[PDB]
Amino acid sequence: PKMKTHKGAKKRVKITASGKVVAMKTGKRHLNWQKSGKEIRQKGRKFVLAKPEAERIKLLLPY
Amino acid sequence: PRAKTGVVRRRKHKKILKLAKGYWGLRSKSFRKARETLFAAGNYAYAHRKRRKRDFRRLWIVRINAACRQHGLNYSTFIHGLKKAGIEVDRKNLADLAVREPQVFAELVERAKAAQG
Amino acid sequence: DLRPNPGANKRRKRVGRGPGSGHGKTATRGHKGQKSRSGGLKDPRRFEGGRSTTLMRLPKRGMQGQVPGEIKRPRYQGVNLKDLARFEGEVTPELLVRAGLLKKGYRLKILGEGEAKPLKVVAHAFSKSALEKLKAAGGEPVLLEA
Amino acid sequence: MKEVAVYQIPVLSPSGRRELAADLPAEINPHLLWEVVRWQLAKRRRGTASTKTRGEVAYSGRKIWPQKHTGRARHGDIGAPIFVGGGVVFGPKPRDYSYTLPKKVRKKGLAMAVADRAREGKLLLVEAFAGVNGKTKEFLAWAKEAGLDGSESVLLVTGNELVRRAARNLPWVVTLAPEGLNVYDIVRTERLVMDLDAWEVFQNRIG
RNA sequence: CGGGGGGAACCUGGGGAACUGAAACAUCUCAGUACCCAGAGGAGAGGAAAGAGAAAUCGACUCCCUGAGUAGCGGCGAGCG
RNA sequence: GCUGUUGGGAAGCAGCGCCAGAGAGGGUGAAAGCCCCGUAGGCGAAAGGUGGGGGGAUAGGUGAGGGUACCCGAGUACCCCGUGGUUCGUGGAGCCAUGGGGGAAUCUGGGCGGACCACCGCCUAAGGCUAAGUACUCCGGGUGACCGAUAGCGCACCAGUACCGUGAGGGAAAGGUGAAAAGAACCCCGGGAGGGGAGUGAAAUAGAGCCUGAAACCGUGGGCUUACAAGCAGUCACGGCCCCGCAAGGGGUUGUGGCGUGCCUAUUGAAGCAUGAGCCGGCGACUCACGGUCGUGGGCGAGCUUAAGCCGUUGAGGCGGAGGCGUAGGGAAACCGAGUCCGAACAGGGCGCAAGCGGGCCGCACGCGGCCCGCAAAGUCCGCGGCCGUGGACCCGAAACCGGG
RNA sequence: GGUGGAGCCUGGGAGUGAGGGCGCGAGCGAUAACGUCCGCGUCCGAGCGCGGGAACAACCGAGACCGCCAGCUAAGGCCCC
RNA sequence: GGGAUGACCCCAGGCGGUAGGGGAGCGUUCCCGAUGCCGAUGAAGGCCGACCCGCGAGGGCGGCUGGAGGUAAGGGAAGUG
RNA sequence: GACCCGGUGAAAUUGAACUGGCCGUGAAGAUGCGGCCUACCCGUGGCAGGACGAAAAGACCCCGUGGAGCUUUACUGCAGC
RNA sequence: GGGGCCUGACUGCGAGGCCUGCAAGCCGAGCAGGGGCGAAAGCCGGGCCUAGUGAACCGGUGGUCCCGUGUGGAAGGGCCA
């Protein structure tokens, strides 16, 4: 029958206009204890490739 | 629709059985045995068509040799005359002159060994 | 036009791909010739290796919702006066939905770019900068819904 | 670009000429026509081909023999797909071959068919039916005195049952009705005849 | 006066798995599925709001299309919905 | 609708007509609207069910202010504990059900609106009943891009049999003479069985598990060929012999001489002393459904498009815009918007947008308007095809787990 | 310079992730192994197609579209087989 | 490159190949074509064929058997070898 | 009993066989490749060295995130107390 | 190696690159905020340099403008640390 979106993915990565997959930078939910502002800061969003391609394929019905 | 086998098979089968006539034992009564035997027949030919072409070059050379030797020289020297002299002719096949026209052949030899004198 | 000749165009290619015979896609069946492809592989959209999928990336979308459900809310779908200059006279949602945008998509904003025609535009909210373009002849209907 | 439809001598008034829109020979696209036909000939498919799968065969699961030391190939239940008592792999299942062909195309393809019937001249719309009264003998005459000898399989499309009554039982004749104006019939028939009332709706349908 | 017993599927109620899936596996899945039992009938169940949920709203229930793979649920896994 | 014609047999071919609201189809010695049964179309029940589709009959229901403040379903509401249902798995966990303990009230009441409280609203629990629309197919009928005797139900046939098993249970094989029995009087060999003539038939290599009759396999006769030999059995080159041809030439056979390590599978590598196969015939493995994603053929494009179902047919279609994708994106969100998020920041940076034209042609306003076109800015809808997802998803094959017996 | 079944960008579908011999430079081993592990290259794999090497995947020669009773050669040979 | 687009001829290169990608064809069954056309002067099937067309899968054609069905072009589906 | 004659008359096996020896070779143990040696064709009664002979998808070993039986201060529950 | 001041072991960013299958790891001028040291030039976003480490999920403390299931506020979340 029909297809189910993957909530796991839907909950952590956003898909943009150009069809690009964008998600937070992984490495700071707790690592830290002292990491030079630079590291702990430098955390906006980012991409992937051949990998985001794999994502979009799970967020179909949610386009 | 139900595309039952029916006619189709039985036809391709007796088609190989035909190519396989005259073979020993089952090589001609069994599609399988046939099928195989034929494959061998397939390449044995192919290869021998190319062998045949080399087969007759031998026949000729041996004769060509035997002829211009009982005359005076060998096959090594003989083909060098008809080559230095420039008579890019005979063609080991047409060297049946040694069989038919010895008077014409002997002529070639004489104007061949002479190409060395 | 004769009965027996309306024929499929030049690309209906019913040519499927049977994979059984001597020449063509065949025997081990056009593809595969190893194993673990005999009745199923794992994915790979998101699976295998046996390792961290690629699920090492964390959830930002902070607000996956409590259990009661998503919260009812007025939904605003903005429109471009750019696509608005297709008709003249009275411009109000309803004549807007059955026309182009919205389609019961709740409320209607209004912003866009490009030249704006000097008329009346009945909207629920106007974008600052894209409203100064209506300061060059036009209307300004606001609020509503009750 | 030519568009002129015929019209048999009504009562006692000469053959009247009538025409309008790219309905007559306009710009025909065979493809579009053929697709509307499959749709018709297809969606009219019964689709009752069924087979009993191994799960569906009326045998048992009991293992014919022991997996080992039998000197026989291994097997499960007789029902398995191999085995003569069969099971049938991917047999046919009752299913609908009916899809939804675009409605706008189910029209351009209706007009285009009543187009290559016009340019050929085989098109012709009447209005009267002297020898009506619902009798074949009666009708058979009405044709001769029109151009319908019987050398060109005809399609009759008039909203008058009385007339059908006749045309019906004729080989080279294919009765019908206005509402049922399709493409599969227009095409299967060499010459097309239509009344001005069934033609009246034609356009209400086309545009 | 009635009951008992039978009836292919269907139906409602009382019970109720495991293999499987999670590439092990306990929660989770399979699943209230298969199966047992009771009852009823040409159907059964349900049924006139101590309902819905945000609209100065709607107005028995059953059933189909949508909503919707939505809102959510989830070793937030698989997957359910 | 008869006749002539071919033939065993016309319905075939032929000459001239005819019915048709009936040219569905089946049968008849072959292939027929018109010969037989039917068909379109139109009638039919003394009896037995069915039966508001249509009228009655009653059952039963019929009224608005203003004062009281009497009744509004109890081990119940409600709270706590233990669980189940719901999308809800302890979660902020309400709501609905209830095994246990406690335990009211009768509208200034009480339940609910996802803890709880306050406002604002919604509905009246603890008694029942209730058509139609929905589900299924043993049987009956009707159609089929359903099968055709290894298919199709297990069973076309005296089959849930024969046969197997203590039992539950398992579970077969097996259709066909011809138009018609006209199924072979009698005679000959024989105990019989079988046969040879005669006889029937158009046909008897249609003679009775008899149409067709394939291959494996078994024989008789004939042609070529072999007892100094050596081989995956063939292939190539000559030569003898037999044979159809007017002949160039071509068959069948095999005497010499040249060259050759089966097929399949699995493998770094197989003739391999690795796997599989006695041989033949038949059954036998990449499918469909719904989503998705690329390609591709068409439809239409500021758009595209219907779903359930309703009026139509009964191989004819329409209608139906609920709804879905697209037209704008950024942000966790409030939200802002050709911007937006991070930020104090008319620093920066991250996702974003900025999208056209060769020009057919034309009102002859010395304006390229602007239709249209490749099909787009840009997309959708249907078709077809590749691969992905859920399904037993390419076919066979476990040891095992569970449930009822 | 180089127009090559070269490259570069986007997209559909893959198979393969058991390799093997040889030469060269190393480690391991005993400078033993048709051993083992890396590195550069080659060939077999998939060229068990053809020539030479008696026979013989990978050594020498050489990339087999078909046919030829025609010729030049490569490796290797020229007494007979 | 010809270019009377003439997919019909010229110039020059390529054409071993497993897993696999891609491209065109052949046959099977059923459907439209069909109230049509083959047919007892002989269907489908079968048995031979050194003959004809295709590179092939195949396809024609002739004789014999057999005795009643068969079905072009052009397409369409699928229990398709 | 076996052996000869009359009567009845199986079986596992079975790629096809026109199935010799020796050095050598080859995926390292050849009737089947190479060189040489032998060797008329066909049986019957015997013997068992070879056909890596038959039989049994190795009972050993390993591998499979295979299965079952058993244990306990493995984990986690449950009956019971 | 010693001394004097100090807290830049900064906040908001980040051009352009090393490395790489993914995600990670590393370097970084320069602009703004507000500072240290120096007369100034200037240097300071820890340490002479390469090890001193751990995705996500689940939760805890701070903060905070975000959401608060009819409204106000809560419970509970989100964001930054």
Side-chain angles (χ1 to χ4, degrees), chain B residues 94-115:
Chain B
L94 291 169
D96 83 305
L97 300 185
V99 190
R100 307 282 188 61
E101 315 307 311
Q103 279 220 306
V104 178
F105 195 72
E107 240 278 67
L108 271 172
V109 171
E110 285 293 51
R111 295 316 298 289
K113 56 201 298 180

PDB file of all heavy atoms in Angstrom, chain B residues 94-115:
ATOM      1  N   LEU B  94      49.469 -22.344 -57.335  1.00  0.00           N
ATOM      2  CA  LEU B  94      49.639 -22.522 -58.775  1.00  0.00           C
ATOM      3  C   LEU B  94      50.914 -23.250 -59.141  1.00  0.00           C
ATOM      4  O   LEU B  94      51.199 -23.448 -60.318  1.00  0.00           O
ATOM      5  CB  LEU B  94      49.580 -21.176 -59.496  1.00  0.00           C
ATOM      6  CG  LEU B  94      48.193 -20.532 -59.484  1.00  0.00           C
ATOM      7  CD1 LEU B  94      48.303 -19.111 -59.969  1.00  0.00           C
ATOM      8  CD2 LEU B  94      47.228 -21.340 -60.346  1.00  0.00           C
ATOM      9  N   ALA B  95      51.682 -23.645 -58.131  1.00  0.00           N
ATOM     10  CA  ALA B  95      52.902 -24.392 -58.375  1.00  0.00           C
ATOM     11  C   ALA B  95      52.483 -25.842 -58.598  1.00  0.00           C
ATOM     12  O   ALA B  95      53.061 -26.772 -58.041  1.00  0.00           O
ATOM     13  CB  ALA B  95      53.824 -24.283 -57.198  1.00  0.00           C
ATOM     14  N   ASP B  96      51.426 -26.010 -59.391  1.00  0.00           N
ATOM     15  CA  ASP B  96      50.910 -27.326 -59.765  1.00  0.00           C
ATOM     16  C   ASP B  96      51.521 -27.501 -61.143  1.00  0.00           C
ATOM     17  O   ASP B  96      51.263 -28.476 -61.850  1.00  0.00           O
ATOM     18  CB  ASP B  96      49.370 -27.333 -59.850  1.00  0.00           C
ATOM     19  CG  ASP B  96      48.838 -26.813 -61.187  1.00  0.00           C
ATOM     20  OD1 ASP B  96      49.186 -25.677 -61.578  1.00  0.00           O
ATOM     21  OD2 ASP B  96      48.055 -27.548 -61.834  1.00  0.00           O
ATOM     22  N   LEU B  97      52.335 -26.512 -61.504  1.00  0.00           N
ATOM     23  CA  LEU B  97      53.050 -26.492 -62.770  1.00  0.00           C
ATOM     24  C   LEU B  97      54.063 -27.618 -62.682  1.00  0.00           C
ATOM     25  O   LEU B  97      54.423 -28.232 -63.678  1.00  0.00           O
ATOM     26  CB  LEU B  97      53.776 -25.151 -62.962  1.00  0.00           C
ATOM     27  CG  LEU B  97      52.926 -23.874 -62.978  1.00  0.00           C
ATOM     28  CD1 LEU B  97      53.806 -22.672 -63.310  1.00  0.00           C
ATOM     29  CD2 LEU B  97      51.798 -24.021 -63.996  1.00  0.00           C
ATOM     30  N   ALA B  98      54.516 -27.885 -61.468  1.00  0.00           N
ATOM     31  CA  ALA B  98      55.478 -28.941 -61.255  1.00  0.00           C
ATOM     32  C   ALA B  98      54.818 -30.284 -61.545  1.00  0.00           C
ATOM     33  O   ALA B  98      55.491 -31.290 -61.791  1.00  0.00           O
ATOM     34  CB  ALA B  98      55.966 -28.888 -59.838  1.00  0.00           C
ATOM     35  N   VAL B  99      53.492 -30.287 -61.520  1.00  0.00           N
ATOM     36  CA  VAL B  99      52.726 -31.499 -61.777  1.00  0.00           C
ATOM     37  C   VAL B  99      52.286 -31.603 -63.240  1.00  0.00           C
ATOM     38  O   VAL B  99      52.373 -32.670 -63.848  1.00  0.00           O
ATOM     39  CB  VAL B  99      51.464 -31.555 -60.894  1.00  0.00           C
ATOM     40  CG1 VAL B  99      50.814 -32.930 -60.999  1.00  0.00           C
ATOM     41  CG2 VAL B  99      51.823 -31.224 -59.454  1.00  0.00           C
ATOM     42  N   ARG B 100      51.816 -30.489 -63.798  1.00  0.00           N
ATOM     43  CA  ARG B 100      51.351 -30.454 -65.181  1.00  0.00           C
ATOM     44  C   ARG B 100      52.452 -30.149 -66.188  1.00  0.00           C
ATOM     45  O   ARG B 100      52.891 -31.036 -66.920  1.00  0.00           O
ATOM     46  CB  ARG B 100      50.254 -29.410 -65.338  1.00  0.00           C
ATOM     47  CG  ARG B 100      49.111 -29.565 -64.369  1.00  0.00           C
ATOM     48  CD  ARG B 100      48.156 -30.662 -64.773  1.00  0.00           C
ATOM     49  NE  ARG B 100      46.965 -30.655 -63.926  1.00  0.00           N
ATOM     50  CZ  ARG B 100      46.109 -29.637 -63.823  1.00  0.00           C
ATOM     51  NH1 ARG B 100      46.294 -28.519 -64.519  1.00  0.00           N
ATOM     52  NH2 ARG B 100      45.064 -29.735 -63.012  1.00  0.00           N
ATOM     53  N   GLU B 101      52.896 -28.894 -66.222  1.00  0.00           N
ATOM     54  CA  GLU B 101      53.924 -28.468 -67.171  1.00  0.00           C
ATOM     55  C   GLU B 101      55.357 -28.453 -66.636  1.00  0.00           C
ATOM     56  O   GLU B 101      55.855 -27.408 -66.215  1.00  0.00           O
ATOM     57  CB  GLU B 101      53.589 -27.072 -67.693  1.00  0.00           C
ATOM     58  CG  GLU B 101      52.140 -26.878 -68.094  1.00  0.00           C
ATOM     59  CD  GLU B 101      51.649 -27.930 -69.074  1.00  0.00           C
ATOM     60  OE1 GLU B 101      52.342 -28.176 -70.092  1.00  0.00           O
ATOM     61  OE2 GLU B 101      50.563 -28.504 -68.825  1.00  0.00           O
ATOM     62  N   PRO B 102      56.049 -29.606 -66.664  1.00  0.00           N
ATOM     63  CA  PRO B 102      57.426 -29.622 -66.160  1.00  0.00           C
ATOM     64  C   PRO B 102      58.326 -28.767 -67.044  1.00  0.00           C
ATOM     65  O   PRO B 102      59.288 -28.168 -66.565  1.00  0.00           O
ATOM     66  CB  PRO B 102      57.792 -31.104 -66.196  1.00  0.00           C
ATOM     67  CG  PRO B 102      57.021 -31.603 -67.377  1.00  0.00           C
ATOM     68  CD  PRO B 102      55.675 -30.923 -67.212  1.00  0.00           C
ATOM     69  N   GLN B 103      58.000 -28.714 -68.335  1.00  0.00           N
ATOM     70  CA  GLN B 103      58.763 -27.916 -69.293  1.00  0.00           C
ATOM     71  C   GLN B 103      58.608 -26.430 -68.979  1.00  0.00           C
ATOM     72  O   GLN B 103      59.533 -25.643 -69.180  1.00  0.00           O
ATOM     73  CB  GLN B 103      58.292 -28.181 -70.726  1.00  0.00           C
ATOM     74  CG  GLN B 103      58.862 -29.430 -71.370  1.00  0.00           C
ATOM     75  CD  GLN B 103      59.208 -29.198 -72.830  1.00  0.00           C
ATOM     76  OE1 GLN B 103      58.367 -28.757 -73.623  1.00  0.00           O
ATOM     77  NE2 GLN B 103      60.455 -29.487 -73.192  1.00  0.00           N
ATOM     78  N   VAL B 104      57.435 -26.050 -68.488  1.00  0.00           N
ATOM     79  CA  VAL B 104      57.182 -24.661 -68.137  1.00  0.00           C
ATOM     80  C   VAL B 104      57.773 -24.394 -66.765  1.00  0.00           C
ATOM     81  O   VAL B 104      58.296 -23.312 -66.502  1.00  0.00           O
ATOM     82  CB  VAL B 104      55.676 -24.358 -68.081  1.00  0.00           C
ATOM     83  CG1 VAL B 104      55.455 -22.905 -67.665  1.00  0.00           C
ATOM     84  CG2 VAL B 104      55.036 -24.647 -69.434  1.00  0.00           C
ATOM     85  N   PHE B 105      57.682 -25.394 -65.893  1.00  0.00           N
ATOM     86  CA  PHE B 105      58.208 -25.279 -64.536  1.00  0.00           C
ATOM     87  C   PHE B 105      59.724 -25.127 -64.628  1.00  0.00           C
ATOM     88  O   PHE B 105      60.284 -24.122 -64.181  1.00  0.00           O
ATOM     89  CB  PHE B 105      57.842 -26.534 -63.711  1.00  0.00           C
ATOM     90  CG  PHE B 105      58.016 -26.366 -62.212  1.00  0.00           C
ATOM     91  CD1 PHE B 105      57.135 -25.577 -61.473  1.00  0.00           C
ATOM     92  CD2 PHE B 105      59.077 -26.979 -61.548  1.00  0.00           C
ATOM     93  CE1 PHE B 105      57.315 -25.401 -60.101  1.00  0.00           C
ATOM     94  CE2 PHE B 105      59.264 -26.807 -60.177  1.00  0.00           C
ATOM     95  CZ  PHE B 105      58.386 -26.017 -59.457  1.00  0.00           C
ATOM     96  N   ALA B 106      60.370 -26.125 -65.230  1.00  0.00           N
ATOM     97  CA  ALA B 106      61.819 -26.150 -65.399  1.00  0.00           C
ATOM     98  C   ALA B 106      62.322 -24.800 -65.883  1.00  0.00           C
ATOM     99  O   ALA B 106      63.429 -24.374 -65.543  1.00  0.00           O
ATOM    100  CB  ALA B 106      62.205 -27.236 -66.386  1.00  0.00           C
ATOM    101  N   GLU B 107      61.496 -24.133 -66.681  1.00  0.00           N
ATOM    102  CA  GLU B 107      61.837 -22.821 -67.215  1.00  0.00           C
ATOM    103  C   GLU B 107      61.984 -21.847 -66.055  1.00  0.00           C
ATOM    104  O   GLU B 107      62.996 -21.154 -65.931  1.00  0.00           O
ATOM    105  CB  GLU B 107      60.741 -22.348 -68.171  1.00  0.00           C
ATOM    106  CG  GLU B 107      61.224 -22.094 -69.597  1.00  0.00           C
ATOM    107  CD  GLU B 107      61.868 -20.726 -69.785  1.00  0.00           C
ATOM    108  OE1 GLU B 107      62.955 -20.466 -69.212  1.00  0.00           O
ATOM    109  OE2 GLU B 107      61.270 -19.909 -70.522  1.00  0.00           O
ATOM    110  N   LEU B 108      60.969 -21.804 -65.202  1.00  0.00           N
ATOM    111  CA  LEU B 108      61.006 -20.929 -64.047  1.00  0.00           C
ATOM    112  C   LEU B 108      62.266 -21.164 -63.225  1.00  0.00           C
ATOM    113  O   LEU B 108      62.963 -20.210 -62.876  1.00  0.00           O
ATOM    114  CB  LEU B 108      59.765 -21.141 -63.187  1.00  0.00           C
ATOM    115  CG  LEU B 108      58.616 -20.239 -63.635  1.00  0.00           C
ATOM    116  CD1 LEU B 108      57.319 -20.586 -62.910  1.00  0.00           C
ATOM    117  CD2 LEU B 108      59.021 -18.796 -63.386  1.00  0.00           C
ATOM    118  N   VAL B 109      62.561 -22.430 -62.927  1.00  0.00           N
ATOM    119  CA  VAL B 109      63.755 -22.791 -62.149  1.00  0.00           C
ATOM    120  C   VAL B 109      65.001 -22.214 -62.800  1.00  0.00           C
ATOM    121  O   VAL B 109      65.817 -21.566 -62.141  1.00  0.00           O
ATOM    122  CB  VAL B 109      63.955 -24.338 -62.043  1.00  0.00           C
ATOM    123  CG1 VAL B 109      65.307 -24.655 -61.429  1.00  0.00           C
ATOM    124  CG2 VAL B 109      62.865 -24.950 -61.199  1.00  0.00           C
ATOM    125  N   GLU B 110      65.143 -22.452 -64.098  1.00  0.00           N
ATOM    126  CA  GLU B 110      66.299 -21.962 -64.825  1.00  0.00           C
ATOM    127  C   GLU B 110      66.423 -20.444 -64.790  1.00  0.00           C
ATOM    128  O   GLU B 110      67.533 -19.917 -64.682  1.00  0.00           O
ATOM    129  CB  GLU B 110      66.264 -22.479 -66.260  1.00  0.00           C
ATOM    130  CG  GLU B 110      66.638 -23.957 -66.359  1.00  0.00           C
ATOM    131  CD  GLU B 110      68.096 -24.228 -65.991  1.00  0.00           C
ATOM    132  OE1 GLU B 110      68.545 -23.779 -64.912  1.00  0.00           O
ATOM    133  OE2 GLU B 110      68.799 -24.896 -66.783  1.00  0.00           O
ATOM    134  N   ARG B 111      65.293 -19.739 -64.871  1.00  0.00           N
ATOM    135  CA  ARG B 111      65.316 -18.280 -64.821  1.00  0.00           C
ATOM    136  C   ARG B 111      65.207 -17.826 -63.366  1.00  0.00           C
ATOM    137  O   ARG B 111      65.131 -16.633 -63.073  1.00  0.00           O
ATOM    138  CB  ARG B 111      64.176 -17.681 -65.663  1.00  0.00           C
ATOM    139  CG  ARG B 111      64.279 -17.962 -67.182  1.00  0.00           C
ATOM    140  CD  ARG B 111      65.708 -17.767 -67.749  1.00  0.00           C
ATOM    141  NE  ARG B 111      66.235 -16.403 -67.621  1.00  0.00           N
ATOM    142  CZ  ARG B 111      65.810 -15.355 -68.327  1.00  0.00           C
ATOM    143  NH1 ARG B 111      64.841 -15.499 -69.225  1.00  0.00           N
ATOM    144  NH2 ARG B 111      66.357 -14.159 -68.137  1.00  0.00           N
ATOM    145  N   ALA B 112      65.218 -18.797 -62.462  1.00  0.00           N
ATOM    146  CA  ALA B 112      65.146 -18.535 -61.035  1.00  0.00           C
ATOM    147  C   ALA B 112      66.545 -18.629 -60.437  1.00  0.00           C
ATOM    148  O   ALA B 112      67.020 -17.690 -59.803  1.00  0.00           O
ATOM    149  CB  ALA B 112      64.234 -19.539 -60.370  1.00  0.00           C
ATOM    150  N   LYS B 113      67.200 -19.769 -60.642  1.00  0.00           N
ATOM    151  CA  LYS B 113      68.549 -19.979 -60.122  1.00  0.00           C
ATOM    152  C   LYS B 113      69.518 -19.063 -60.847  1.00  0.00           C
ATOM    153  O   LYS B 113      70.607 -18.768 -60.353  1.00  0.00           O
ATOM    154  CB  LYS B 113      68.971 -21.446 -60.294  1.00  0.00           C
ATOM    155  CG  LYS B 113      68.912 -21.979 -61.719  1.00  0.00           C
ATOM    156  CD  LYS B 113      68.832 -23.512 -61.760  1.00  0.00           C
ATOM    157  CE  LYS B 113      70.051 -24.192 -61.148  1.00  0.00           C
ATOM    158  NZ  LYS B 113      69.940 -25.689 -61.192  1.00  0.00           N
ATOM    159  N   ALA B 114      69.096 -18.616 -62.027  1.00  0.00           N
ATOM    160  CA  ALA B 114      69.891 -17.715 -62.848  1.00  0.00           C
ATOM    161  C   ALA B 114      69.845 -16.339 -62.201  1.00  0.00           C
ATOM    162  O   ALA B 114      70.787 -15.557 -62.312  1.00  0.00           O
ATOM    163  CB  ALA B 114      69.330 -17.656 -64.263  1.00  0.00           C
ATOM    164  N   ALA B 115      68.744 -16.047 -61.517  1.00  0.00           N
ATOM    165  CA  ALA B 115      68.610 -14.773 -60.828  1.00  0.00           C
ATOM    166  C   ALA B 115      69.804 -14.653 -59.884  1.00  0.00           C
ATOM    167  O   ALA B 115      69.960 -13.661 -59.172  1.00  0.00           O
ATOM    168  CB  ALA B 115      67.318 -14.735 -60.048  1.00  0.00           C
TER     169      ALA B 115
END
